[PDB]
């Protein structure tokens, strides 16, 4: 039970698979253009953003950090979220960070 | 079902078949070539990219390429390094359109 978000690197959703509806309660659109810490628990918030740039510093790396995802029913939902950076195989740039974010 | 397009050597797209752009449903340059790929290809197509920068050609048996609906569209695609003064210059890729059962059927043959 997870789905895929890919993320720019100032963490916000730029695609969302329709697996969250199930796991979060939104729908893709919902998530798109928002930054990921927008639906982090307060108290996590400080360990997802440094995180996400460290996911951004350690290019292709696969990190992983837990938190409490904010579902649509606002609940606080414990989620692994598993990242890492897409280099682009010639330029080495960071096309977009991806994560697969499991329900716990 | 047939067509080509044309990329720098980081696959950005600089120029599609009007056969393409309507297939996808697009614009289609000033974007990066992996921000249609799907998610579960990614891997597949990066390292196909790799052949195709070491190699001077590379090929894509079956992965998804999102279309402007938001759907996925199959794709089998030929690439191929065109070169210039010897040195690399830009990417030719030849695609062919699957439909959905042969491309999931050679999604676990890739």
Same mark, same amino acid.
């Given at each position: 039970?997870?789905?895929?978000?890919?993320?720019?690197?100032?963490?916000?959703?730029?695609?969302?698979?329709?697996?969250?509806?199930?796991?979060?309660?939104? &729908?893709?659109?919902?998530?798109?253009?928002?930054?990921?810490?927008?639906?982090?628990?307060?108290?996590?918030? &400080?360990?997802?953003?440094?995180?996400?740039?460290?996911?951004?510093?350690?290019?292709?790396?696969?990190?992983?950090?837990?938190?409490?995802?904010?579902?649509?029913?606002?609940?606080?939902?414990?989620?692994?979220?598993?990242?890492?950076?897409? &280099?682009?195989?010639?330029?080495?740039?960071?096309?977009?960070?991806?994560?697969?974010?499991?329900?716990? | 079902?047939?067509?080509?397009?044309?990329?720098?050597?980081?696959?950005?797209?600089?120029?599609?078949?009007?056969?393409?752009?309507?297939?996808?449903? /697009?614009?289609?340059?000033?974007?990066?070539?992996?921000?249609?790929?799907? /998610?579960?290809?990614?891997?597949?197509?990066?390292?196909?990219?790799?052949?195709?920068?070491?190699?001077?050609?590379?090929?894509?048996?079956?992965?998804? /390429?999102?279309?402007?609906?938001?759907?996925?569209?199959?794709?089998?695609?030929?690439?191929?390094?065109? /070169?210039?003064?010897?040195?690399?210059?830009?990417?030719?890729?030849?695609?062919?359109?699957?439909?959905?059962?042969?491309?999931?059927?050679?999604?676990?043959?890739?």
């Amino acid at each position: 039970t997870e789905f895929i978000s890919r993320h720019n690197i100032e963490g916000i959703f730029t695609f969302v698979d329709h697996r969250c509806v199930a796991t979060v309660g939104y &729908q893709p659109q919902e998530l798109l253009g928002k930054n990921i810490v927008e639906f982090c628990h307060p108290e996590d918030q &400080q360990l997802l953003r440094d995180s996400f740039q460290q996911v951004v510093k350690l290019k292709g790396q696969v990190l992983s950090v837990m938190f409490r995802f904010r579902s649509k029913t606002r609940e606080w939902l414990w989620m692994r979220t598993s990242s890492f950076t897409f &280099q682009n195989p010639y330029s080495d740039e960071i096309e977009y960070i991806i994560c697969t974010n499991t329900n716990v | 079902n047939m067509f080509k397009s044309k990329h720098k050597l980081d696959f950005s797209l600089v120029s599609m078949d009007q056969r393409g752009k309507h297939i996808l449903g /697009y614009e289609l340059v000033n974007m990066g070539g992996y921000d249609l790929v799907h /998610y579960d290809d990614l891997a597949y197509v990066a390292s196909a990219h790799q052949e195709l920068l070491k190699t001077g050609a590379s090929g894509m048996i079956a992965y998804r /390429y999102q279309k402007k609906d938001g759907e996925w569209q199959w794709l089998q695609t030929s690439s191929r390094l065109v /070169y210039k003064n010897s040195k690399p210059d830009f990417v030719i890729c030849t695609h062919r359109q699957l439909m959905d059962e042969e491309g999931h059927d050679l999604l676990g043959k890739r």
